[PDB]
Amino acid sequence: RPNSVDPALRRPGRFDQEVEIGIPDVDARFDILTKQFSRMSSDRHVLDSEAIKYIASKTHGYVGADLTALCRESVMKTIQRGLGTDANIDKFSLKVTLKDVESAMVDIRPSAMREIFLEMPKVYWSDIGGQEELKTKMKEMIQLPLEASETFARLGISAPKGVLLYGPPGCSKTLTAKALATESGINFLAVKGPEIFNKYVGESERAIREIFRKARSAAPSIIFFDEIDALSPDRDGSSTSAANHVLTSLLNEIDGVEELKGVVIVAATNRPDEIDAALLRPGRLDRHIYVGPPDVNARLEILKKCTKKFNTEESGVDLHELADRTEGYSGAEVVLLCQEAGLAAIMEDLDVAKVELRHFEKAFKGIARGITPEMLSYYEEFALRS
Amino acid sequence: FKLPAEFITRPHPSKDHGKETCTAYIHPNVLSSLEINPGSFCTVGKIGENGILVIARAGDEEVHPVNVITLSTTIRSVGNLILGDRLELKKAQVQPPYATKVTVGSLQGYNILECMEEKVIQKLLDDSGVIMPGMIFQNLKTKAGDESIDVVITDASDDSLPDVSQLDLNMDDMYGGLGSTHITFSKETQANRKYNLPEPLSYAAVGGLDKEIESLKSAIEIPLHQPTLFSSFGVSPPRGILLHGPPGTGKTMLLRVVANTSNAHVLTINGPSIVSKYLGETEAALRDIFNEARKYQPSIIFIDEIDSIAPNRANDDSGEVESRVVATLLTLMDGMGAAGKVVVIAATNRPNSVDPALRRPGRFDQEVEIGIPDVDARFDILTKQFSRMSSDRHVLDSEAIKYIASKTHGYVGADLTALCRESVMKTIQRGLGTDANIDKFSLKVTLKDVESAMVDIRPSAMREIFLEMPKVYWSDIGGQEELKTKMKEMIQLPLEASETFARLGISAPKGVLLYGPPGCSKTLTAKALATESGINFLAVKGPEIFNKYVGESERAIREIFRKARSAAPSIIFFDEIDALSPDRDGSSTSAANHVLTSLLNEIDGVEELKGVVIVAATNRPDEIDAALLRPGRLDRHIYVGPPDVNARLEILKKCTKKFNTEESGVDLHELADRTEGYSGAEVVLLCQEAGLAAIMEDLDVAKVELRHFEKAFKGIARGITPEMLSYYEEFALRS
């Protein structure tokens, strides 16, 4: 670390030349992997160019030492699998394949020790149900920065890089971020809010600084937060100085004498009035999305998707009357209702190819929406006030 | 002027016959320095155990270095001389008079050999030396029938004037070609307990950890015994294996066993003894040790208590011996050998306190975790321990061993060995006190002394993350059949219909909530479910995880969740959830909020735990945080209210089993009808009070009568109120 170096050495009269070797990118990692494979030659392995490219793309934050460790652990896993299964077969017969490498990179844990910006899984569009306005704003806020940099430079619009996601819990608040991680293809990173708190004091600040530096050096990406409602409230409720330090560090990173045009920061919150006034200021987190409960069409799509495994035609349900009746619920509520209906169907005679209407009615009667109109009124008041 | 201070042991090369007992390849300048005739005996100080093994000395071919010497694998096995022990050179003692008996043992065999004996005596004492209490040699080749048979000479009865002589060598004078007194072959005796020579403990003694035994076995003969197989790939093998776990699990006995079972050279370090004021002395010593290890291809490095040697960066910058040693060790073990055959064994207590730089896949990609033994492992350990003393020294049925293993829930292998030690202590002291010095062999081991041993041991592992609770069957169940069927279906879903869930996409809610009276029907039901389902059970209490320190509860919860996930699909149950869920109402500290958020985002957040099942039982559900009571997780709700008539009848019959129902005159129905709704705990208390009243009259009683029941019913109140039942019903209907 150059910071720990004595500034007397760090002088233009002494050390005017500085050589910095940053973290390898996708191209450098691919080159290193190709060189390593050429080093051990094609006798001991069979790897294609697309396989190496896929491995390099998957290892977004790994380093050359990490790549060598991955290759070594894949070698041990292949050797032990061959010994266990093939009963001491020829070494060159099994050589190196891709499944052992995938298992090794899954089990090795990513390069960032105790990282908080995790790589959450992806899911395709037809598995996503929600309103079209949120999807339109989604396409808005992804299409503007990627292919409007020149327009912003010529027009002075720049990038606000601030979007606030407030809405009822459990209804597609993080679904938009998940679909964005799937569709965009850019390296996505997500933080669980309460995970930032640890027993040690000061570790959170340095972890945030190092992960922000990694995001800056890892090409323009998108940054998303799961539940900022655990760190934002410091004046409404009692909190330690660590939370205030985290809040002011985040404020300085977002708009404190620094600008991050490449990356876009989006924050998702459950309670709308627990965000601190300093954090909720013009210039940051400007965009606000209602992202309320799913409409009739989204609920119908979710019901059809859940009933897709079952036989909808001979079950007698039109997939629309049930959705109309189940109007006060949400996506998660509909999902759990379908799960309970399936459980009631399977508890009768084990495997079933359908779900009965009486079982669905019983499940609906048993379960409750769990959502109160006063919270919706509070959300509306917050929307009008902001 | 050579001044040899320490010596190193090394196997005799080329095998064959040669000397094979009196090789003694010591360089001639060392022979002249000690001023002792080469054609005489010699001793290898081996840092202690004075007397050693007086063995005739010889000379080398001037190629053997001074540091290493040859004492023959026979003497290595006899004295348990592990390759790597520090040695010293001392002059020979007085010659012994003669031999008296000498008798073979014929280890690991059924004896009665005759056919393949073929006059062993000629080959038995054709070699020089041949100490009569100890010898081990290869089977060689006797007639047909190949196979492997070893001969041991355990028992000894010769008399030596100096008691310093540990193994009392004797002269050899046999008659043969190509007899002592009264032959030599007699019986298949084990190692004699009169002298009690050290034994080469193997994997047979270690039990209950076989699953990791195979893992360590693979870790030890992938790089070492098969170097060409790994070198065929050319990616270099890891040079370090990390062993960690709670103290007392037996890492050192295990590393000792794996060192003894391997004939290759090993390196051991005292640890803090190396630490010294001089900055470069430690570096030079470690570099010399590493160079010596590299010079001979078969070498294994053992580094015990490495945590103190390698402290964490942020924990403390103490000074003196510090990160410079860590850096030089990294640069060394990552710098010399490309393929080689070298492994470093690191033993530590707390992996977190160890340097994270060491805990990297680049050098320490192999991690070994040795958890505390479970019921099966403890039972195996006890069975091995009693098999060590065999049936001659004690008699105990396997049922008693299983009962003791079930009773011992938090004990470790060291704890069990101790427990046996004070069991023997209690037996000895009781025999001395009562029998007045009779032959105590007949008394042997019983159950009363062992029970007193569990009573008086008071193990220090009471505060542990793994807990076990006594098991009950369906007979002890008092409840309604509706909830029984519900929980049976719930437990049968993930274990049986996993493929149905996968194909239909229904999956499992993995959340069960049990709200009921604080009396009973939760803990006992959980006990019986654990007993019958056969799935691993973890008992976690509410106030137990709460302590003065802030953040320790979160770390403990994360650790227990991780090891439960990695310890096969198991059910997780919390005894008290109301002690942590209310945070806004009770103005709880940040630790409780962090714990609640962590459990919320781990039960059904970012990751799905399909294998494990989460079940919760608590009281007063309305006081908990609304975040936990959210749709999608813990959706299942069971009334689990007061027991019905059948449940109370069964409980009363079970409590009255020790009594005579027909003699007491009670019909087992009117009492339950009267006390139909209070609780089950008060029923148990009433039964205990009635029994106390019955035994108050004339000590032991063969019956309980009805007056005692009436007095117990009148004296003991209910303590239950309709308003809590109304509140529970209101909560049930609102959900």
Ligand SMILES: Nc1ncnc2c1ncn2[C@@H]1O[C@H](COP(=O)(O)OP(=O)(O)OP(=O)(O)O)[C@@H](O)[C@H]1O
């Ligand atoms: N699985 C086991 N098999 C046999 N003996 C065992 C086993 N586990 C523990 N022991 C006994 O434990 C005793 C001491 O073990 P040892 O001192 O090596 O523990 P350790 O786990 O390395 O120590 P610590 O964890 O406290 O640092 C030995 O006498 C040994 O017989």
Ligand SMILES: Nc1ncnc2c1ncn2[C@@H]1O[C@H](COP(=O)(O)OP(=O)(O)O)[C@@H](O)[C@H]1O
């Ligand atoms: N089509 C679907 N089928 C099944 N599960 C889904 C589907 N869409 C979203 N989910 C689940 O719903 C969750 C949505 O999270 P969300 O409720 O937005 O977070 P929050 O609780 O912070 O509002 C995701 O974790 C995802 O696993």
